[PDB]
Structure 1
Amino acid sequence: LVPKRVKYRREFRGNMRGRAKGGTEVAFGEYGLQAVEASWITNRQIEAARIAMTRYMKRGGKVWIKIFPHKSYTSKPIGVRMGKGKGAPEGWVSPVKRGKIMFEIAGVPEDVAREALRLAAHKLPVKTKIVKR
């Protein structure tokens, strides 16, 4: 998951204060994985969690990724002093605020959904809760 293009190549880290303004109620699937505390979810973590959910379902039922990594983040290499302008873009993150349903799934029984989502949750740097519609 990467933005096809971006207005600006570099961008503020921002902050993660408050409950997510939207996407706090499961809207597509039966079951959803709700963030309980805030964190940056990198695209590498979203892919890890997606494959983990999907493999366990065996091409059965649907998986909605409700978060997208819109925000680039930069880094400085090792052995580079501070200054000389902002570092090069490294990757892509989605700042997930608390209460944000990150994944949703439908078309499998509760037990498989609940199992799929715990496998997904173990790849994410955030405390999760499984919630249903």
Structure 2
Amino acid sequence: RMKYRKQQRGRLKGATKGGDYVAFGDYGLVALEPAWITAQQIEAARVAMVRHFRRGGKIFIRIFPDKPYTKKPLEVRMGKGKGNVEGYVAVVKPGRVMFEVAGVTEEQAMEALRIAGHKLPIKTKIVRRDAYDEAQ
């Protein structure tokens, strides 16, 4: 909700930023293919997330739209598009961890995310943890 905007499409090269690590939560949802995820999609996932286990734990959505997706009105050529119209999106490079759950069973957690994946226009993978950290 700010700054001067209606920006350049730009492209998604290798996913040099497609691969973080569960930061909070317990289990997670990492992306396999690069893409633009419409807020419309995030919610549509998150919602079903919470909704899968009514009155459950916590949901963390690390990805976040901010890129304005413009579009023409159904005509020809003459200056950038009315822009936005539908809205904004976030850019996901294969490997980024989109959503992550916690405070619940793996049977409940794992199965929860699985659904989300159906909402997102990508191919996903689910992860656990115990991996990366900065301890000794």
Runs of 4+ in 1 over 4 A off after TM superposition: none
Structure 2: which amino acid aligns with 1:52?
A
In the alignment, the residues of structure 2 paired with residue 93 and residue 26 of structure 1 have an alpha-carbon distance, to the nearest angstrom, of: 22
1:118 to partner: Cα distance: 0.8
Task: Say if 2:76 is the partner of 1:81.
Answer: yes
Give the structure-2-normalised TM-score.
0.88
Go from structure 1 to structure 2 and tell me whether the alpha carbon gap of 1:20 and 1:66 turns closer, same or farther (over 3 Å shift). Answer: farther
In the alignment, the residues of structure 1 paired with residue 4 and residue 99 of structure 2 have an alpha-carbon distance, to the nearest angstrom, of: 28
Would you say how many aligned residue pairs link Structure 1 and Structure 2? 127
Percent of aligned pairs sharing the same letter: 58
Query: What per-residue deviation string (whole Å, max 9, x for no partner) do you get for residues 15-60 of structure 1?
Result: 1112252761001001111001101110000010001110112121
In the alignment, the residues of structure 1 paired with residue 107 and residue 25 of structure 2 have an alpha-carbon distance, to the nearest angstrom, of: 15
1:18 corresponding residue in structure 2: 14
Q: Structure 2 stretches of 5 or more lacking a match?
A: 130-136
Stretch of structure 1 that moved more, 12-21 or 31-40: 12-21
1:61·1:108 contact (CA, 8 Å) conserved in 2? yes
Give the structure-1-normalised TM-score.
0.90
Stretch of structure 1 that moved more, 38-47 or 14-23: 14-23
2:42 corresponding residue in structure 1: 46
Higher strand share: 1
Q: Structure 1 stretches of 5 or more lacking a match?
A: none
Query: What per-residue deviation string (whole Å, max 9, x for no partner) do you get for residues 58-82 of structure 1?
Result: 121110010000100110011x112
Secondary structure of 2:70 counterpart = strand
Task: Say if 2:132 is the partner of 1:119.
Answer: no
